[model samples]
Target: SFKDLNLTDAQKQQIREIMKGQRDQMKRPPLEERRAMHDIIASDTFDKVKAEAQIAKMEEQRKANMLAHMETQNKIYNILTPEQKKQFNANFEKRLT
Candidate 1:
């Protein structure tokens, strides 16, 4: 299924960058810290710069993770042959239906 998209080396490199960023974000502090930061944002009572910074970092990490997953999926798709992709799409469509 992955052997299809005929991706260029440039595209692969771009995706690699995205994935690396995501991995880096995942190494951040545990969820408890993140949740506390979110709570600060929600309370509206807190307007500290540190809290805002934490929230920004968390958002950045979220975006990174999303981009990384997308890039990984694209990379996998790029590896597939046209026929394989066709088959995959057909099967996927069937599942959806």
Candidate 2:
């Protein structure tokens, strides 16, 4: 189905690279770190107020990162030939549905 869209292998590779980079960054801290984060939040000794502030900061950073990634993806999509852009829109709409 995707091959019918006629996306060049290079475009596919670019998308994979973009996704993988984001995935890798998100996973960089490791499962252990995530568990530790939960533990800290659950601990009596931990300061809930401080943790809440830290969480807010992290969330802001995550949103900024996602927005930057989205902007780059939009730029790449816009650079595609009109036919490729149409195919991209079709695929995107299909995924949404």
Q: Which predicted model would earn the best lDDT?
A: 2
How well does candidate 2 score on lDDT at residue 28? 57
User: Could you tell me every candidate's TM-score relative to the true structure?
Assistant: 0.40, 0.49
Those runs of model 1 whose alpha carbons end farther than 4 Å from true positions after fitting are 1-30, 33-57, 90-97
Name the weakest run of 10 consecutive residues (lDDT summed) in model 1.
1-10
**Taking the tens digit of each residue's C-alpha lDDT, what string does model 1 give over 1-97?**
3334445686567656655755544565777776877788788487688776766666766787778777776665565567756776776786753
State the RMSD for candidate 1: 8.2
* Tens-digit lDDT string for candidate 2 (13-49): 8767666655424545556547657877787798877
Q: lDDT per model, in order?
A: 0.65, 0.68
Clash pairs detected, candidate 2:
none
lDDT of 1 at 1: 34
